[PDB]
A paper describes a structure:
The frontline antitubercular drug isoniazid (INH) targets the mycobacterial [name], [name]. Inhibition of [name] by INH–NAD results in impaired synthesis of mycolic acids. Here, we report the identification of the diazaborines as a new class of direct [name] inhibitors.
Compound screening against purified [name] [name] identified three initial hits, AN2918 (6-aryloxy-benzoxaborole), AN3438 (5-aryloxy-benzoxaborole), and AN6534 (7-aryloxy-N-sulfonyldiazaborine), which had inhibitory concentration (IC50) values against the enzyme of 44, 12, and 79 μM, respectively. AN2918 was not active (IC90 > 200 μM). AN2918 (6-aryloxybenzoxaborole) had activity against [name] that did not translate to [name] activity, whereas a close analog without the para-CF3 group was inactive against the enzyme and [name] (data not shown), whereas AN3438 (5-aryloxybenzoxaborole) was active against both the enzyme and [name]. To understand the binding mechanism of these boron-containing inhibitors, co-crystal structures of AN2918 and AN3438 with [name] were solved to 2.5 and 2.55 Å, respectively.
Residue numbers in the entry: 3 to 201, 212 to 269
The structure:
């Protein structure tokens, strides 16, 4: 039980292909007691979370909603029992409107759309940390999901910009979280077939290039390797790593080709 008796909040489950879902699954297999947050289709999310190996309370959280953030810590402590604190927080939340992504030209995305995407994808990592650090134990771990944005690439467009912002936000969260003995890190995943992927020739070349570049290969169908990596960061086995990015991408980013 890598996470034996750790209390861990996990956001961002929308389907059972969600990366968050597999993080939640692997964490429970490893003895973690979870609290879960879900955004919009709460009834649907409850049905999806029923398929996890264990029961976990489900709280409503719209990261754009200031009231939800203000009430979050109180709602969490109620669910885990007063006197108890969190050892773990997982941010697995991303969004960018269609105008900011894919076939749509980079220059045509209006700021309102980009701003919303940045709000949800980058700024929310800080506001979740603000809301939850007060109910976190020393030795604890905050973890967010990243996609390496250090080089530009077709299609990913303004979401790349959002991820660049996130990485920077992560380094500042690490400063604040350090005052509580809490670590903050990001996991940079290779591409994964999720619901979000749903929203062409260049993206396929990027994927296949992925497996080819990855010295141990990469399998877009399998979220388990990134779930494990996130669990490794939630654990006590990376105690001197903070403000940082761990690459769970088959090693692809270390190879030019």
């Amino acid at each position: 039980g890598l996470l034996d008796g750790k209390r861990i909040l996990v956001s961002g489950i929308i389907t059972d292909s969600s990366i968050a879902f597999h993080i939640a699954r692997v964490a429970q297999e490893q003895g973690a007691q979870l609290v879960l947050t879900g955004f919009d289709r709460l009834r649907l999310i409850q049905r999806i979370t029923d398929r996890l190996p264990a029961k976990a309370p489900l709280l409503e959280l719209d990261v754009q909603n200031e009231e939800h953030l203000a009430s979050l810590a109180g709602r969490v402590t109620e669910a885990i029992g007063a006197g108890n604190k969190l050892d773990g927080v997982v941010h697995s939340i991303g969004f960018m409107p269609q105008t900011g992504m894919g076939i749509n030209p980079f220059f045509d995305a209006p700021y309102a759309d980009v701003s919303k995407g940045i709000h949800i994808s980058a700024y929310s990592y800080a506001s979740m940390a603000k809301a939850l650090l007060p109910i976190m134990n020393p030795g604890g771990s905050i973890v967010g999901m990243d996609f390496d944005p250090s080089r530009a690439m077709p299609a990913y467009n303004w979401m790349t910009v959002a991820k660049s912002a996130l990485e920077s936000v992560n380094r500042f969260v690490a400063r604040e979280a350090g005052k509580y003995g809490v670590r903050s890190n990001l996991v940079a995943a290779g591409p994964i077939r999720t619901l979000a992927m749903s929203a062409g020739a260049q993206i396929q070349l990027l994927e296949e290039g992925w497996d080819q570049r990855a010295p141990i290969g990469w399998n877009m169908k399998d979220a388990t390797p990134v779930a494990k990596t996130v669990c490794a960061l939630l654990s006590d086995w990376l105690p001197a790593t903070t403000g940082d990015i761990i690459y769970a991408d088959g090693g692809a980013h270390t190879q030019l080709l």
